[PDB]
Design a protein around this nucleic acid. Structure first.
Ligand SMILES: [Zn+2]
Ligand SMILES: [Zn+2]
Ligand SMILES: [Zn+2]
Ligand SMILES: [Zn+2]
Lengths: 79, 77
DNA sequence: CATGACCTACTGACCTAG
DNA sequence: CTAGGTCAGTAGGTCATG
């Protein structure tokens, strides 16, 4: 309840279902808002930690969904 | 006689006429009090249920009025 | 130009006067 | 009964930095 279940950074609370950090939060939010398809240049299992979370987006996105981060809870843009 | 007619959630009775949950009741109370006008980013046809009632505020406010929810049943501050 | 560290609004479950 | 009310927790920001 104190760590980001995706990259191991300090959590700021539950976001879209799972305890995560501000970096992983905005990442998911930025993807579904714009509907972004990601390709992994590796074997679809790149490690995701605090230091190399931005190495492979694809696996960082998949790691969010395997941890239960809901696409549905991402509201639409405002104003 | 216990289902919210707007989003299918559990209903606590009549709120401004129509059977609705506390979430949709509070949303309608705040939409007239502040006179908030909404715009939709899609084709004004978003699905309104328990899981994405917070997705589009435009379609959620539209489904309220279409379900019979009355604007005059809201008292002033 | 995709990041993320800062910042507010908006929920809705849980209260009480008529 | 259905009108009111709050406020912690999760949503929405924006914008300088690489
Ligand atoms: Zn993270
Ligand atoms: Zn990868
Ligand atoms: Zn409802
Ligand atoms: Zn919409």
């Amino acid at each position: 309840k104190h760590i980001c279940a995706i990259c191991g950074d300090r959590s700021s609370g539950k976001h879209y279902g799972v305890y995560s950090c501000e970096g992983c939060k905005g990442f998911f939010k930025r993807t579904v808002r714009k509907d972004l398809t990601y390709t992994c240049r590796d074997n679809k299992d790149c490690l995701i930690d605090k230091r190399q979370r931005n190495r492979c987006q694809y696996c960082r996105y998949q790691k969010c969904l395997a941890m239960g981060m809901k696409r549905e809870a991402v509201q639409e843009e405002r104003q």
